[PDB]
């Protein structure tokens, strides 16, 4: 229901890994892939990093459809790109 | 997107604990939450592990629309209630 972005995150096949995790804001959603990336270890290395060690998939609450709206994981790193090289 | 239910699942206020899964169906989803009480060990004892002990929330995907619609907890429970009694 309430939170903007819910976060599905696993490192490989183990169901162990599958953690989600609720942002308030993109930003938020951002900052905690970011802080995944920093704890587990450039542009290029980030993108690899999330298409080989972890996989990603941002659920966007689309508040008029009271509904999440699934989007790509390439949608959530382009946006991520974005706060990297602003920042 | 494909996943009929993704069921987001926590053990009080430890993100740690916040575990997702994905179901084909129903019957699938009421498996594994009777699985996380069983190996975590009557209908009261069912309905009170999931209200203080761990929390639960299923997401099911509406293919017509595309998206994920959040329903409470009680609706999955209630549902794992009818499950139960059959079996």
Known sequence: AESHIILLIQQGS???TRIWSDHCSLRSAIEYIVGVYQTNQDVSRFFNFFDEIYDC????YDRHFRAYIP???????????????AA
Do not use: R, S
Request: net charge negative; aromatic share 10%.
């Open 71 to 85: 989007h790509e994981k390439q949608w959530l790193l382009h946006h991520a790109q974005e706060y990297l090289t």
């Open 14 to 16: 183990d169901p162990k």
């Open 57 to 60: 998939v941002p659920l966007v």
